[PDB]
Write a protein that binds this ligand. Sequence first.
Ligand code: NA
Length: 357
Amino acid sequence: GSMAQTLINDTFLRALLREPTDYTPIWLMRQAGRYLPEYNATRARAGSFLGLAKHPDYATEVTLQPLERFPLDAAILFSDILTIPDAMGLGLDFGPKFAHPVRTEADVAKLAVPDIGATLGYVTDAVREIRRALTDGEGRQRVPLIGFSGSPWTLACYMVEGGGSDDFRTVKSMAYARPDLMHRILDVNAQAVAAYLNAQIEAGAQAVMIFDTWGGALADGAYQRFSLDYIRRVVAQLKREHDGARVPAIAFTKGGGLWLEDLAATGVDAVGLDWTVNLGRARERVAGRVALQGNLDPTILFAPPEAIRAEARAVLDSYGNHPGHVFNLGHGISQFTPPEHVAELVDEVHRHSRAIR
Ligand code: NA
């Protein structure tokens, strides 16, 4: 009779849709990561970061690790944003480096949307396996699964740079010097990101997140032309429903607090925020049009437990007693974070938000 397997805990999906809930749900960027000794042990068995991402059993294993420690309200597919340019044939290795950086008109001409099934089957296989792993003995799902991609601009940054960077000055200078080529890269990336996210949804992702980690490096004007317009192009092409449920879409431009209204008008269900943004003011700014995700400074997780819990209370109090907040950090968990500080954060967010709500 029911549309899908029983989801025991769906508060995360409900908050992204601005629905009534009993508490504020929480998941954390890099919840699978080097701060967990078991992640490092698994990474050692796999041989490398890419080994973990490219084999669905390893990807599934590390995705589930934080859920065994903490009562988080969602799982996020373990992968990397750079799977797409790898599938485009740029030769990813592990920061990240490409054997073939995108520099010339001829390089750009060779870019094409990958056949997602044929080149990135390992990602959809991980999504399928994680959905099976999140199922208990009675067939019920424990928590929802988040699928994800880099934004067209953020992918372009790595593609043109030829790997990681601290400022991506080389790609930004290409946007000003050769805007036509830049737009061509962004066009192909947007088509690829939509295809990739849609494939993840079909495989069982129940929400999707677009990580525009480097959008905040761009000047006003440039941000809209080279990043935001392409986020909109992706969202316009996304499946918005699957298995009888809305599939919420989230966009996060780190450093993008000035453009919240712009992001909230792209068609996404939710916008991610970093710690510089006043969460209550942001809620007013969007006037309930979208859910907000964030926005604790991850550096707070180095402070004592009483400080961590007080700061978690302050974030929640800033948002206030209204639907539509998913608690998260404004960036990923540091590799040096004590896991018990994550436990304390999750506990306080749950208890204090229940007291509010
Ligand atoms: Na609830």
